[PDB]
Structures are given as C-alpha cells and as structure tokens.
C-alpha cells in the first residue's frame, strides 16, 4: 500500500518522474496515418507510464486493461493540449509536428475536433495551468474514467473501486496542496479545483467525438494496421 502514504509533494514528484518521453513524429489518409502512427507509439509509453501511477499496479490486470482502454484517447488529448498550451492557435503533436487549425481540414470532420482541442488549450493557458497540476489531472483521468465501468458483481471488484477512490482522494489533497503553496485562498482553491475537474468533462467529450471519428476513419480503410492502436480502438 505505497500509494496512500505518499505526501502531496511525494505524489507530485513521483508523477513528474513517470512522465513519458516526448516522441518525434515520422491528403486525408496520410494525415490520419501521421496522427495514428504517433498515437500508437505513445500508447506503448503510456502503458509504461500507467504502471508508474500510484495505486495502478495494485489493481488486477483485467482492471488495468480496463482503465487504459477507457481513458487512453483522453490521455493523449490532455497531453497534446498541455504541450500546445504555449502555442496559441497551434497543436503541438510532437516537436517536429506543429499543426495549424486550418491543417485540420485535410481530414473530414477533424477540424471540428482540432477546434475543441485548441479551445481546451486556450482555457488551460488562460488559467495558467501548472505542470504539477497537469500530471495530477492526467492520473485522475486514468483512474476515474473506467472506475464506473467496472464489473460491479464481485466483492473483489468492489474493493478495487474503493481503493481507486482512496487514491483519487489523495490526488485531490495533492491538488489542494499545490494551490495553497501557490498562495490561493481556501475559496480560490476549491474554485480552481472544480474549474479543472469540470474540464476533464469536456475532455471526456472531445474523446468521445474523436473515438467516433477514428472508428469512422477506420471504416473508410484509411487507418494503417497499427496493432496496439486498433486494440484500444476495438474495446468500444
């Protein structure tokens, strides 16, 4: 039970050291091939990362597989939104792949999602989101997205959920702590906390639209045979 003993500062630190490496990247089909090739490679590193997320390895394998399947696109979006944050009007998929909004028009229905992503990036920028807050939010996403979509028929399954909600509580304390160090009023803290968790709600939305878009692109036969990405996609 390492997870629940970690202090605020130990949680933040531990999350900053699990951060995956930033990858470089290598018509409608080619744009989709470009984005899904990046996504597929990051998935490999997102798995290594999830294992380093406190309390994650404590779950059953079937539940680890469940949380990553539910949250993965949400996790690629929040990371994309975060690193685009200093790049107004631009999406920084990779250090060698900085995409304009108008570059979304290469793919049917994609510019819409780019708009949603850039608006989220602007919100994070206007709020002056900190990196320490970002890593907290991404771990919340991993832990909370599939917690409600678990086999609620087993006592063991009911213990998994309870453990996940004790850990998520920790992360809330961690976020509160970070906001106090930043010298926020108690009022300003819980306001900021809610403003951020409410953004996870738009991110779940963006992810639902992007999942629809990718399944639709796969049906057009314009998605290459990236085995791990299709594995995630086909869990819906």
């Amino acid at each position: 039970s390492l997870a629940l003993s970690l202090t605020a500062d130990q949680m933040v630190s531990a999350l900053l050291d699990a951060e995956p490496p930033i990858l470089y990247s290598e018509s409608e089909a080619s744009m989709m091939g470009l984005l899904t090739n990046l996504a597929d490679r990051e998935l490999v590193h997102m798995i290594n990362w999830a294992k380093r997320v406190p309390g994650f390895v404590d779950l059953t394998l079937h539940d680890q597989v469940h949380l990553l399947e539910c949250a993965w696109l949400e996790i690629l979006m929040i990371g994309l939104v975060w690193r685009s944050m200093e790049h107004p009007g631009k999406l920084l998929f990779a250090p060698n792949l900085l995409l304009d909004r108008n570059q979304g028009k290469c793919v049917e229905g994609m510019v819409e999602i780019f708009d949603m992503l850039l608006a989220t990036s602007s919100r994070f920028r206007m709020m002056n989101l900190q990196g320490e807050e970002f890593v907290c939010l991404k771990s919340i996403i991993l832990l909370n997205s599939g917690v409600y979509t678990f086999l609620s028929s087993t006592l063991k399954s009911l213990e998994e959920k309870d453990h996940i909600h004790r850990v998520l509580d920790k992360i809330t304390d961690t976020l509160i702590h970070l906001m106090a160090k930043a010298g926020l009023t108690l009022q300003q803290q819980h306001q900021r906390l809610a403003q951020l968790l409410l953004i996870l709600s738009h991110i779940r939305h963006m992810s639902n639209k992007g999942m629809e878009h990718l399944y639709s692109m796969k049906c057009k036969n314009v998605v290459p045979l990236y085995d791990l990405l299709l594995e995630m996609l086909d869990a819906h």
Partner: peptide, 9 residues
Amino acid sequence: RXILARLLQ
C-alpha cells in the same frame, strides 16, 4: 487475449 495485456504484465 493481448499487446496491451503483454506490456502491462
């Protein structure tokens, strides 16, 4: 079944 399954184990 699995790649996810294998990288998590």
